[PDB]
Design a protein around this ligand. Structure first.
Ligand SMILES: O=P(O)(O)OC[C@H]1O[C@](O)(CO)[C@@H](O)[C@@H]1O
Lengths: 287, 325
């Protein structure tokens, strides 16, 4: 109950490249290794894990795991046989999302023209993998990255992407509308994909998209399958205060909702998706 | 349909030493009808030269010359419908004749054509060239359309004053007129590329600015010009490239028009069949062949008007229409 948080922090420690939701899956799966009250224990694990990270991916990635195991309980019921079919099905789920970023990269790196000049937001381990696969296919391009206050993740990305021998420019956070005509396409990594096909990414993604549709630059999103959250925002207030805030007055939301009309395509795990297509998949991921 | 606008395919009735219309005006009208003189500036120069020929042969004045040369412009409206450059030229000429008070007035009139052609068609072209030299940078690529005597002058002098750009020439059927741009570019040594209007959305990804020519700027900022211009500017905005139109002041007509339907001459439809499956189109009753000569692009599709007064944002052409009158 408290060692759960410690193990989750450890999965952050010895694996920074592993996603937050995957860390939640691993620590929750180990907690599963320790009838119907066990579903309540896993729901409590969801609450305690979302209470310390508050990303959309954690409360969605763990929430599919509350459903990917409870789908097997619809097939059969037991007391310890059900726990072992739970662990051999959860291990399959966990090893089926260790291959997510590679599949996204294989789908998305074919959308970058040679000699292109992309624009990306703060820091995505998926956008980084899309560009890593794009330079491994002998494409050459330029990357514009916004520094993306307050945590300056854009500088972390450009330091993590200069090793790939790519011309990367840490543009100012305010200057998206300036360099937006210098961009062939926009690749961002969603922190959660809501039910209408729009995304929830770090603050400033929305005005990256609104500028994009102002100049008809394609706005590509590279999310994963477990980031499909069941929310349906209609404006920026409809995003819950769980997700927006990690904690002369400062405001500081950390995420904002991007409308699905602004998004050209989503390169999720389960194939390239129109923003409409996402909704179907969400239905399929929750019957 | 296009019922109010006129369909034409006219010198058979007039006597060979013509007395109804002046000899020079007959030559001018038949050159308009056949196609020997094309382009708004070339038509205005030819019209003013023919009017100088008419005035120097005039023997007697203010009312008499105006009501004598009104049938000449009726003939020219019959032969080929007058563009607004010609309209403003005729308006200036009638104002000049009515302004002349009570022989020697023929020489003073004939020089006022020369003082009209110089400082509104030639000096204006030089000033527009100087202004558009600023908007042409090294390395950019410029999409022009059709043939314009001013657009090609701007490109040629921008090249010979040291720029190193590239031109894409977009052309349309049935006049196939941008070839007259294209060849005239290649003689200047400018790199060029040629393709038709349907391929415009293929090259608007690479184009840096679209530099068009205007046959008339109307009183709301709509640009009346060759039929592909509005469509080309629309695709240009959809690929977010700036659209520049280069027009002299004297082509500004106070007529206003929203849609491309009010004043749009129709050339003969027999130009349309290409080498045939359309040669027998008269015998098909339902089939009608339609080719417009002009259309209007709205002022929101045009980013810049270059004029001898300066560079104006295409919503302040009524400003210039005010300050010149
Ligand atoms: O690709 P990741 O690391 O899983 O996260 C994607 C998005 O979530 C953030 O890391 C935090 O919102 C953003 O920087 C990024 O755009």
């Amino acid at each position: 109950d408290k060692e759960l948080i410690e193990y989750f922090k450890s999965q952050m420690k010895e694996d920074p490249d592993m996603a937050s939701a995957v860390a939640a899956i691993r620590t929750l799966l180990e907690f599963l290794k320790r009838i119907q009250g066990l579903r309540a224990n896993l729901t409590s694990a969801i609450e305690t894990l979302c209470g310390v990270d508050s990303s959309v991916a954690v409360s969605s990635g763990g929430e599919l795991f509350l459903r990917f195991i409870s789908l097997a309980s619809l097939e059969y019921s037991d007391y310890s046989k059900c726990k072992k079919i739970m662990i051999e099905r959860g291990e399959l789920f966990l090893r089926r999302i260790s291959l997510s970023r590679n599949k996204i990269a294989d789908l998305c790196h074919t959308f970058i023209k040679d000699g292109a000049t992309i624009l990306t937001h703060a820091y995505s381990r998926v956008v980084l993998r899309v560009l890593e696969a794009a330079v491994a296919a002998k494409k050459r391009f330029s990357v514009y990255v916004t520094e993306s206050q307050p945590d300056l993740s854009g500088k972390k990305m450009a330091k993590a992407l200069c090793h790939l021998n790519v011309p990367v420019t840490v543009v100012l956070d305010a200057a998206v509308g300036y360099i937006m005509e210098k961009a062939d396409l926009v690749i961002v990594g969603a922190e959660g994909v809501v039910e209408n096909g729009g995304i929830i990414n770090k603050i400033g993604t929305n005005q990256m998209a609104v500028c994009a549709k102002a100049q008809n630059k394609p706005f590509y999103v590279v999310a994963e399958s477990f980031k499909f959250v069941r929310l349906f925002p209609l404006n920026q207030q409809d995003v819950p205060d769980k997700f927006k805030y990690k904690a002369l007055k400062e405001e500081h939301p950390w995420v904002d909702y991007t409308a699905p009309s602004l998004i050209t395509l989503l390169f999720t795990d389960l194939g390239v998706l129109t923003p409409s297509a996402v909704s179907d998949e969400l239905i399929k991921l929750y019957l | 349909l296009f019922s109010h606008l006129p369909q034409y395919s006219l010198t058979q009735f007039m006597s060979i030493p013509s007395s109804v219309i002046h000899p020079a005006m007959v030559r001018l009208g038949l050159q308009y009808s056949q196609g020997l003189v094309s382009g708004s500036n070339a038509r205005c120069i030819a019209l003013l030269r023919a009017l100088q020929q008419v005035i120097q042969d005039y023997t007697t004045l203010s009312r008499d010359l105006v009501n004598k040369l009104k049938p000449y412009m009726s003939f020219l409206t019959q032969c080929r419908p007058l563009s607004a450059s010609m309209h403003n030229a005729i308006k200036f000429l009638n104002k000049e004749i009515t302004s002349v008070g009570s022989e020697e007035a023929k020489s003073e009139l004939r020089a006022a054509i020369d003082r009209y052609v110089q400082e509104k068609i030639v000096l204006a072209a030089q000033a527009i060239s100087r202004f558009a030299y600023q908007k042409i940078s090294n390395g950019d690529v410029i999409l022009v359309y059709g043939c314009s005597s001013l657009v090609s002058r701007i490109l040629q002098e921008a090249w010979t004053e040291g720029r190193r750009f590239r031109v894409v020439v977009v052309d349309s059927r049935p006049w196939l007129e941008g070839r007259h741009t294209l060849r005239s570019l290649v003689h200047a040594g400018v790199p060029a590329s040629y393709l038709l209007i349907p391929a415009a959305s293929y090259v608007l990804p690479e184009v840096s600015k679209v530099l068009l020519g205007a046959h008339a700027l109307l009183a709301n900022g709509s640009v009346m010009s060759r039929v592909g211009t509005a469509q080309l500017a629309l695709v240009a905005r959809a690929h977010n490239v700036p659209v520049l139109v280069c027009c002299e002041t004297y082509k500004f007509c106070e007529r206003v028009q929203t849609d491309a339907f009010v004043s749009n001459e129709l050339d003969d439809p027999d130009d349309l069949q290409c080498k045939v499956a359309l040669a027998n189109w008269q015998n098909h009753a339902s089939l009608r062949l339609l080719n417009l000569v002009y259309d209007v692009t709205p002022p929101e599709l045009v980013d810049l008007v270059i004029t001898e007064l300066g560079m104006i944002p295409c919503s302040s052409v009524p400003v210039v229409l005010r300050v010149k009158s």
